[PDB]
Amino acid sequence: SLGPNGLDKMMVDKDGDVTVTNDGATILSMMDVDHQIAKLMVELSKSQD
Amino acid sequence: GRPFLIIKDQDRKSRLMGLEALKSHIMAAKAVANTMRTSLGPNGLDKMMVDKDGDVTVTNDGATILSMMDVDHQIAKLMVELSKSQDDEIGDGTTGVVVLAGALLEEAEQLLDRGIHPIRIADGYEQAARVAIEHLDKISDSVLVDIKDTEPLIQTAKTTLGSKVVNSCHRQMAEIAVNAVLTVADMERRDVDFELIKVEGKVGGRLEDTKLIKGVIVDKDFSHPQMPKKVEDAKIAILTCPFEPPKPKTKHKLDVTSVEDYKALQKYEKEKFEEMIQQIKETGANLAICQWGFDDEANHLLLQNNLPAVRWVGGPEIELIAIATGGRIVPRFSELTAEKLGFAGLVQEISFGTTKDKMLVIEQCKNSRAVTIFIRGGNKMIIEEAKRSLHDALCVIRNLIRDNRVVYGGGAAEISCALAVSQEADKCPTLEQYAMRAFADALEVIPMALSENSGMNPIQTMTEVRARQVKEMNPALGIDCLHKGTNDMKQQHVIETLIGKKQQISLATQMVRMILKIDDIRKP
Amino acid sequence: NPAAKVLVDMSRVQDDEVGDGTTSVTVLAAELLREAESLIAKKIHPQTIIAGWREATKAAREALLSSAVDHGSDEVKFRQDLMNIAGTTLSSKLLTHHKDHFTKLAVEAVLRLKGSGNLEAIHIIKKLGGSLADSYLDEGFLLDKKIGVNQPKRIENAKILIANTGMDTDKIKIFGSRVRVDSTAKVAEIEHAEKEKMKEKVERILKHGINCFINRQLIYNYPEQLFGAAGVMAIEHADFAGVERLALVTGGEIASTFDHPELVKLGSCKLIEEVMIGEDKLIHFSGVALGEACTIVLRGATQQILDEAERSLHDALCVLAQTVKDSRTVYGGGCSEMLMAHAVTQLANRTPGKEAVAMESYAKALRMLPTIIADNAGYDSADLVAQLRAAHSEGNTTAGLDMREGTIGDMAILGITESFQVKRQVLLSAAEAAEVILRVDNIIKAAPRKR
Amino acid sequence: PVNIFKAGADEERAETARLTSFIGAIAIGDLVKSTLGPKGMDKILLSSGRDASLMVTNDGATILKNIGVDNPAAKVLVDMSRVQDDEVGDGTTSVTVLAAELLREAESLIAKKIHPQTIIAGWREATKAAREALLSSAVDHGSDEVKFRQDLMNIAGTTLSSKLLTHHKDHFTKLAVEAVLRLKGSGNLEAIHIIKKLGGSLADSYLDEGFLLDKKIGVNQPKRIENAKILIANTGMDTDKIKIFGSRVRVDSTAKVAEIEHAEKEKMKEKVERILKHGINCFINRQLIYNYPEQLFGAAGVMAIEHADFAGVERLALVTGGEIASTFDHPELVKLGSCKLIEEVMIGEDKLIHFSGVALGEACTIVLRGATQQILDEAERSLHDALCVLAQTVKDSRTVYGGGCSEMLMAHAVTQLANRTPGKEAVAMESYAKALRMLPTIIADNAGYDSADLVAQLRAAHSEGNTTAGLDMREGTIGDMAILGITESFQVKRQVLLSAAEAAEVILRVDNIIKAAPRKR
Amino acid sequence: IQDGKGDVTITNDGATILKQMQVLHPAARMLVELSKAQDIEAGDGTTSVVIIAGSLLDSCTKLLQKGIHPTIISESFQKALEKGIEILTDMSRPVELSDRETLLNSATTSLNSKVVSQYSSLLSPMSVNAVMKVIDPATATSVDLRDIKIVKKLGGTIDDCELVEGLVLTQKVSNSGITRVEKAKIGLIQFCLSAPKTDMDNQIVVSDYAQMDRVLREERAYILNLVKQIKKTGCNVLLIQKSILRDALSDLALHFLNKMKIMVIKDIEREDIEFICKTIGTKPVAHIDQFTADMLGSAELAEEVNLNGSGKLLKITGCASPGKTVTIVVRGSNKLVIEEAERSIHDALCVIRCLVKKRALIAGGGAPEIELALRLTEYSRTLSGMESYCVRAFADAMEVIPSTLAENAGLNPISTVTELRNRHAQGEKTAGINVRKGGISNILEELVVQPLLVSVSALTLATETVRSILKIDDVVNTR
């Protein structure tokens, strides 16, 4: 997704809602994360945002 | 009275009776007839289907399609049986007759909702079939076919190959089929048995390679692969026994009470071997045609005798070799003589190059009786398609052995018979005109589905063609089969069988009359 | 899907015919069906497409045959074309990585054919290890069996006779015989009689005075001891292919009757001796009479390498034999394709009506192939295809995509000669299969054959 | 190389994701492509868990409304259709099928290993040029009453082709026109009333010269009144509770309770007389009323109307010239509603009260005496769409040309731009232009005409410069709508193209579909 | 008809029959809604209309195999509808509300298809007299069914179902004393005769022993005086509206009324009181201060009457108010014959309502359908093309229903079809199918007629429904 010509990501939450974005925190938050490093990195990108 | 078991196990017992049973019949049969629509006659498509064991087979030879189905309802199995009957009778209209039956039962279900006994409908169908076949026999033209003129037969087969992919070449097959029929026909008896022709095919090659060989093909190589491979004109013999010493078909215990008995037997063994060699070498025949194989001693001896032979040759191919060579059958060397030998035109070995198969052909200089047809194509689907198509063509020619075995088809016959049926039916009292008109409608069903399959604007096509063939009467104004204008069939000349259409009409009429009667049903 | 089985069957047919382009015909058929589904999505009568492709394919066949060139008038040019085609085949498979080491070698093998098929006459041997460069074609012949003790260990200039006889039990052709005696002395007498019958049979065979022997069936212990008493080399049971190869290379006969010691021809060779090949033993046969059948030695890092090497080289041998059968060739891949596309396009100019769009779709379908070639290379496609269309539209019918780099160049100097027969057959078969599969109207699956 | 998602959580970060999105998009496109042009055929949304509730519809808005999906791109397009229908009306069909064609273009382009940003920039520029060209071709009217009326007639007639009501177009389109005339230039949408009464024919329907009410009357109210002085109220009138609480009746004898009852009756009578001091012949109550107020009103003998609707009372206050009151100390500071006659009418098998000769006619009431509930529902949907289009074209007077005319205009402009543009973008834009060419094509496909012939003729005509060239849908020929009368809303097509552009922009810029693990159900 | 639940139904009108079934197929629902529409606009005829629609569907099926495009097919549908309008208009005739005999013929022909059809001898007067008492023989052109309320009672016989212009009350006199007064006086009360309660809480607090007796006597005197003011008019019957949260009747006041010999009836539903106002002219009283003779009516004789040994029900008759409301009692073996008689009476009522509504009668039997078919064939012959085939299909579709008329009357369909075709093809109209004789005959002497609107709505709604259906082409599964 890097660059002004970035290629955004569009994904669904557990309830059936569509979300498109390019930043990290909004991606990582509503991404279903099972591994614990995954949740650590969700926290990380959320702090950066 | 409380209900009680009268019929054994009425719990799992299912009964249907009355008009609803006829409704089930008509709906299933209409579904099947509409299932089998898009392969009509001179121009159509092919339906592909796989069976239980996972085999791909596609054709418009409708009988095969219906046969290879694991259908559920009984009437559909009856349809499959009817298709097999018509295929084993002529070999064309394998879908035409079933679509006609579907049309007849469409008419039957329409008139049924009008409140009339099915006996009336069956009687109307029978009378209409009578009239239709009578006029179809009035309209067919006799074809004077002799042994030196083949062009009408060539066009007959060419038109017959319509809607059948073999119309790629569309020309050479007609010629080779006519030549094969002429070579193998029994003219006086008017008989042609297809067991005399070894219909064979091998994948690869092209449809241009579709050829007729005026002889026999054999699929066994040399007993001595180092032995010289090809011989010109030769003399053959057919021995129905191996080269092993004669042991009886009764259980035998040959005692050996002495060492000199051992020497006598070990000498008698070879003595018999070279005695057989001398016997067969005396008669002068170049080739030996056996059935059960033999021992390597014979192989090396023939290597030192330079006399070609084969072994393990199967029964029917043995018989066909004997038929083609003109000789007789020699069970054992007692019958062996120079007289009954069979003369060979030329024999050669091929391996199809890249392949590792070996296959000997016998081409005869003198007169032959059993010919062979070989196929080259794209796959086993191509091979089987060509085989079944050419086989149906042979059936067509065998029917065509006689004269007047052709009338203009391509659907024009349907218009003509529908017109005759309507003309006869109109001059009738009531209670019958409805069924006869229904049969007439079933008759023009065929051109409608024809135009649909061609993709032509149907209703206007039939209207214009009907007007053209009504105002001036001729059996040749059918709809475009080559789709290039020129609907006058005295130009396109769709040349197809008479008895094929007549048998289709008869089968459909009898079958619908039969099905009309099953009004009460019982299943478990 | 039944169409998938149809495709794999057309692939198997094209594979058995020649090879090295089965992939091509499959891709071409699939791509034709891609334009077919597109055009039928434009609501077109299928029979029209079928007729259009039939006429277009006939015209393309005529044009390509017109472009066919015969060769073989000399040796150097024809041999160079053979190395060219061999290496071109090796490009399609992995053998490209050492194609040179293969090419000339392969040529020699096809030289030994001398007008006969049955590639089984060519022998291939694999042993794990070595290297692809270590692989080479034997300068003679090879056999893989074992020899007895009382037989010698080194021989030269042997005379060879072949046999397919039963010398294990001397089973008499009559079954039912049995000994009916009482005293076991008679049994000793009859057993000595059998042993002397075998001895006299060995004398019958040895009367030919051969220096080496082979039998297709098992050499039993008593026969082996009698041979050792003679003290000459005898080779035990083997296959049919081995004995046929030996008969070819030495000119002997597979003999099963030995009353004629001088009426037979003996196989000829000059040196027969084992060679310890790494962890294996193979006997070396140098100075054979006929250099017809050959044995190929293969070595590799993994057995999968050996398997694909044998597959690919079998394909190359098939193509080499096919081009030896007919010396009609055309120019390299795509260029012949692209000029056929040009001719079909010229017909499209001449083609009116609705069939025109179908046959021009056919044309661009053909044109798609070099695009895919360029994509597999890893270079820009549109520029090359448009530029080469311009090049072939000017009459420069010898230029084409460069094999060395993603550029454009003449393959006549570059050395890419294409076997006309193979790919005309490929085109015909692809057309036939495509029209067959397009003639469909209905798929009806039967029962799955309930377990 | 390690599992990181929850059970049921999926991520496709390859071309399989775009493949799934594209096949879902195509499944969307083909389902609706049968609902376009004058040749469209309607569809059924059949239910099984909704207790067998069905609705037939032609404007694909309801179709995308009633279908969900797991592929998020299809839901994105559903929301796009939501937006489109939120703006004006029909064209959801148009924008959705156009998006399908553009994504098919994207498929074909990705089939050549191209970085999509080039496509994005090229389509940006193409859209800019196309919008500029269309604005330069924006034909405007309204300077004359007859011209503007005929433009509205043309727009309405062309729009009814896309739906069922075309069978009585002359009896419908023109009628709808007068409705927006009654808006008197006000921007309100919620003045038109929609009425469904099964039975009768769509031609039996009519636009009454007044207003109607569908509420019960009081116990003793006159059936008919003339020159009605009308007042509208919203208070208790239900024994008019004092609104004060935390106050209790706490006595030791019931005579005081009797006096309290008499006093509350008197106070209610006082409220009634307070209202009657203003002086009216017709009273309106937005809500219920009690028996004692009803007896007082019957003593007055006036019309009291009970339990009305908030939107309806707002509409009627706009209509009859009064405004709702809640206090009545001022017989002098209120404006009274006015009507000529208020009578009774029986429609269908339901009872209505008829306003005849109303002092004003701002709001509208469209009665549909159709023949089935489902046809009634789709008829009300269609008239809602048509009146939205009418209001929008009254808002902005600029109009454009349909039948592909403006469409091939922008197509040819983009064609010339691509011709004067170097690089891949050009052919992309050309394909983009080709993409636009598919839209009228599908229209002809709905008719089933000689497709390629017609497309070639239109491209030739637009290359020649004939800027009014269009497709004749009556016979399958090529003519001028200026003769024919096929005109549409400039706003409509403009926003259709712009929304399609931005939807393509957002959809193409996707790389990884990640569906979260389902919660449960 | 029986459902998965306990109740069962017997019916002979296509509408309700269709209502009972529930099908997961959209076409069936479409037909059901069409039947609903025909009911709302007409009430009956659904006995045939859906079958006519299916006949048109099969008629257009053959055209569909013929390949005609659905749009042109729809245009032909519209044109056939338009032509059939005037084709129906042809053989109509004006009617009169003064002559009773044509009216009774209309009602009886409407009720040919009911279970109680043999009971038309008694029932033909009933529904008709119900209709005149509602609207005027002068200019009405508007009829409401809610002007009429019918009561259902189990037991008795069909012969006991009678029409009266009076008011029947399902409520019972709680007082077992005075239960019949002739020329009595009638009163209605909205408020609750109970202890005086306030809008907010009321707490009659007590701080002395004398206060209990004081308040008891005071409340007694209060209720006494209120009821005395009530009796001040000399009333003889009081109706008390049903009340909630409070007792509309007072036990002490109940004894007071028992002492003063006035019938006491309470718990009267909120709505039909206006019906009562429309019935007997009485007007509600919401406060005793309001109470005045102006909201009091007069009656001749009202009593709690017996059902011949089947319970007691309250009846009121003989009031001088020229009301426009009626009621009919229904008795019979079980509730099933009750439903049958109810539906037959409702069909007759709706038929007469439409007849007065749109005064235009059309002969039934066989003449209409055959005239349609003949004229539509000769119209099809005049318009060659795919139009001609479609119009011939229309002309052949209409003959399905008369074929059923022959069939279910125990006759061969085709023979009767031929006979009607021949007879009406010779210009001999009025050729109706005779159920009794079993053939074609002059339908005029057969007394078989129906209003124009019945068939007009039938075919118009059928045509539009068919057109919408063919405009329907795709289905997608939802939740």
Side-chain angles (χ1 to χ4, degrees), chain D residues 31 34 39-50 52-54 56 63 65-68 163-168 198-201 219-220 241-242 244 247-254 257-258 260-262 265-266 291-292 295-296 346 348-351 369 371-375 446-447, chain E residues 23-26 29-30 33-34 36-37 40-41 69 71 74-75 78 142-144 146 190 196-206 211 214-215 218-219 222 241 273-274 277 283-287 289-291 295 353 357 460-461 464-465 467-468 470-479:
Chain D
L31 187 62
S34 167
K39 313 297 298 280
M41 300 88 69
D42 300 65
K43 199 186 305 305
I44 299 304
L45 298 161
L46 167 64
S47 52
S48 66
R50 291 183 289 159
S53 81
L54 79 166
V56 63
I63 294 176
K65 153 155 45 185
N66 289 138
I67 295 298
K163 306 281 140 59
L164 187 153
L165 294 174
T166 177
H167 315 295
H168 323 82
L198 61 83
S201 305
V219 298
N220 187 32
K241 331 290 187 315
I242 316 298
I244 190 65
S247 59
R248 65 181 177 179
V249 189
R250 170 191 181 103
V251 290
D252 308 332
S253 297
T254 75
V257 186
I260 293 303
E261 163 187 3
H262 166 50
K265 308 269 185 299
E266 292 294 328
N291 259 312
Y292 181 64
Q295 205 156 19
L296 268 297
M346 192 305 298
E349 310 311 309
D350 295 331
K351 185 68 177 178
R369 288 234 62 203
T372 61
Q373 294 297 109
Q374 270 300 331
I375 293 170
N446 289 137
Chain E
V23 181
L24 59 88
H25 194 63
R29 300 184 188 92
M30 187 66 203
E33 296 193 5
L34 183 63
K36 293 163 61 64
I40 294 313
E41 191 66 27
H69 191 280
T71 311
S74 63
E75 311 317 305
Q78 184 44 249
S142 293
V143 176
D144 171 60
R146 280 83 61 85
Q190 317 301 279
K197 307 289 105 178
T198 66
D199 51 348
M200 40 204 69
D201 59 344
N202 49 319
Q203 310 172 2
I204 300 97
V205 178
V206 162
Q211 293 162 351
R214 188 156 58 77
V215 303
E218 282 155 329
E219 295 164 294
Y222 181 75
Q241 183 183 22
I273 61 170
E274 62 89 19
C277 306
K283 297 177 173 183
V285 163
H287 182 206
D289 269 337
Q290 321 281 282
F291 164 72
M295 311 75 78
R353 162 223 60 207
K357 267 162 36 198
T460 286
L461 280 71
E464 62 82 26
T465 318
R467 289 198 77 202
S468 45
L470 282 72
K471 216 166 196 154
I472 292 156
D473 68 348
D474 180 273
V475 176
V476 57
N477 178 27
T478 78
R479 281 82 65 193

Side-chain angles (χ1 to χ4, degrees), chain C residues 379-389 406 408:
Chain C
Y379 296 80
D380 178 19
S381 73
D383 74 317
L384 293 180
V385 65
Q387 185 179 4
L388 201 55
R389 278 211 77 221
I408 305 307

Side-chain angles (χ1 to χ4, degrees), chain C residues 102-372:
Chain C
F102 286 133
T103 45
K104 54 177 187 178
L105 184 143
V107 176
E108 199 285 323
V110 178
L111 294 174
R112 290 161 93 133
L113 280 168
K114 314 197 200 307
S116 72
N118 186 262
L119 61 83
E120 294 176 352
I122 297 89
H123 210 64
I124 303 95
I125 296 164
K126 306 169 324 295
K127 305 158 188 289
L128 269 181
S131 176
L132 298 197
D134 288 324
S135 296
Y136 87 98
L137 167 63
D138 175 23
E139 294 84 359
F141 201 72
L142 294 174
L143 293 175
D144 206 327
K145 292 288 174 174
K146 196 57 54 63
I147 312 303
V149 179
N150 209 359
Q151 309 206 45
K153 297 317 173 176
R154 183 179 181 271
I155 48 170
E156 295 87 61
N157 321 298
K159 280 80 71 187
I160 300 97
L161 173 57
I162 315 170
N164 174 22
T165 73
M167 64 184 73
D168 61 338
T169 79
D170 304 358
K171 38 193 172 65
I172 295 90
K173 299 316 185 313
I174 296 318
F175 304 133
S177 60
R178 58 179 173 85
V179 170
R180 209 165 160 278
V181 299
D182 71 343
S183 66
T184 48
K186 316 178 167 50
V187 188
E189 308 152 22
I190 194 166
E191 286 306 318
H192 275 104
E194 299 192 355
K195 295 208 181 186
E196 300 313 317
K197 160 172 176 191
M198 201 75 158
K199 212 155 185 176
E200 80 191 2
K201 191 172 181 187
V202 176
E203 296 325 302
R204 286 188 282 175
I205 309 183
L206 197 57
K207 191 172 45 180
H208 303 236
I210 73 182
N211 200 19
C212 202
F213 172 69
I214 175 63
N215 176 30
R216 184 257 166 191
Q217 283 167 359
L218 188 153
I219 287 187
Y220 204 51
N221 290 256
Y222 191 35
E224 198 158 358
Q225 188 274 330
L226 294 190
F227 296 151
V232 286
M233 185 64 72
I235 314 312
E236 67 175 353
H237 164 85
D239 48 291
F240 303 80
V243 298
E244 289 201 52
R245 279 197 304 283
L246 290 175
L248 294 203
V249 300
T250 68
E253 287 175 1
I254 307 96
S256 68
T257 314
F258 317 94
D259 301 332
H260 319 96
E262 72 267 1
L263 307 190
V264 75
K265 59 204 299 291
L266 276 59
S268 298
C269 181
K270 291 178 70 67
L271 168 58
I272 298 178
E273 183 182 1
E274 69 275 16
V275 177
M276 186 66 204
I277 305 189
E279 296 177 351
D280 301 329
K281 275 286 197 187
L282 281 177
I283 298 89
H284 193 175
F285 304 79
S286 316
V288 292
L290 302 200
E292 312 183 305
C294 76
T295 53
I296 310 180
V297 190
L298 290 195
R299 309 224 50 197
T302 195
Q303 197 54 230
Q304 302 78 334
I305 284 169
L306 308 189
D307 306 347
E308 179 57 24
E310 85 170 347
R311 293 185 275 275
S312 63
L313 65 85
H314 158 263
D315 313 329
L317 183 63
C318 295
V319 180
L320 294 174
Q322 188 60 254
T323 194
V324 167
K325 183 181 186 297
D326 183 11
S327 172
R328 285 180 304 170
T329 69
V330 285
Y331 292 165
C335 186
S336 299
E337 167 278 317
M338 202 185 218
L339 56 89
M340 293 183 286
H342 180 74
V344 173
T345 309
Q346 189 44 51
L347 175 58
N349 300 115
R350 303 176 278 246
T351 315
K354 180 67 174 66
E355 314 207 17
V357 288
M359 61 79 71
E360 71 80 25
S361 66
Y362 182 76
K364 65 179 73 175
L366 182 63
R367 302 224 282 255
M368 186 66 204
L369 277 296
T371 300
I372 311 162

Side-chain angles (χ1 to χ4, degrees), chain C residues 6-23:
Chain C
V6 170
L7 269 292
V8 310
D9 291 331
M10 86 185 271
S11 78
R12 76 180 153 72
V13 171
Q14 162 59 31
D15 178 28
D16 65 58
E17 287 293 325
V18 188
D20 183 43
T22 66
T23 300

Side-chain angles (χ1 to χ4, degrees), chain B residues 447-464:
Chain B
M448 294 183 286
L450 278 170
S451 167
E452 287 297 18
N453 198 326
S454 54
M456 186 66 204
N457 180 7
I459 180 64
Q460 198 49 280
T461 316
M462 283 74 74
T463 290
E464 302 159 291

